[PDB]
Curated annotation (Swiss-Prot):
Catalysed reaction, written as an equation: thiosulfate + hydrogen cyanide = thiocyanate + sulfite + 2 H(+)
Lineage: Bacteria, Pseudomonadati, Pseudomonadota, Gammaproteobacteria, Enterobacterales
Broad class of the protein's primary localization: periplasm
Active site: 48
Protein name per Swiss-Prot or TrEMBL: Thiosulfate sulfurtransferase PspE
Site (May be important for providing the necessary conformational flexibility for enzymatic catalysis) residue list: 74
Primary role: The phage shock protein (psp) operon (pspABCDE) may play a significant role in the competition for survival under nutrient- or energy-limited conditions. PspE catalyzes the sulfur-transfer reaction from thiosulfate to cyanide, to form sulfite and thiocyanate. Also able to use dithiol (dithiothreitol) as an alternate sulfur acceptor. Also possesses a very low mercaptopyruvate sulfurtransferase activity.
GO-annotated cellular components: outer membrane-bounded periplasmic space; periplasmic space
Keyword entries, A-Z: Periplasm, Signal, Stress response, Transferase
Segment of the intact protein contained: 20 to 104 of 104
Length: 85
């Protein structure tokens, strides 16, 4: 399966977020991933407004010992349905 995580400020989430993502900012992803995705073998796709901060979150998660994290890109790149906050 997969889980999707918005890793930026809620400010993007308010206007639109990938349908099925949860806002877990970069600053906090390190701890909150454990409650969002208790099985770190599950696929985790991170994205943010500019793709970069999801890149950083991916590195944080890789340090936390994830096996299937991926930076999807930036919010613009993900071609899933989106919804507002």
């Amino acid at each position: 399966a997969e889980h999707w995580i918005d890793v930026r400020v809620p400010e993007q989430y308010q206007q639109e977020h990938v349908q099925g993502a949860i806002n877990i900012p970069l600053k906090e992803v390190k701890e909150r991933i454990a409650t969002a995705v208790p099985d770190k073998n599950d696929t985790v796709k991170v994205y943010c407004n500019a793709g970069r901060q999801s890149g950083q979150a991916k590195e944080i998660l890789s340090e936390m010992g994830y096996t299937h994290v991926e930076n999807a890109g930036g919010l613009k790149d993900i071609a899933m349905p989106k919804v507002k906050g």
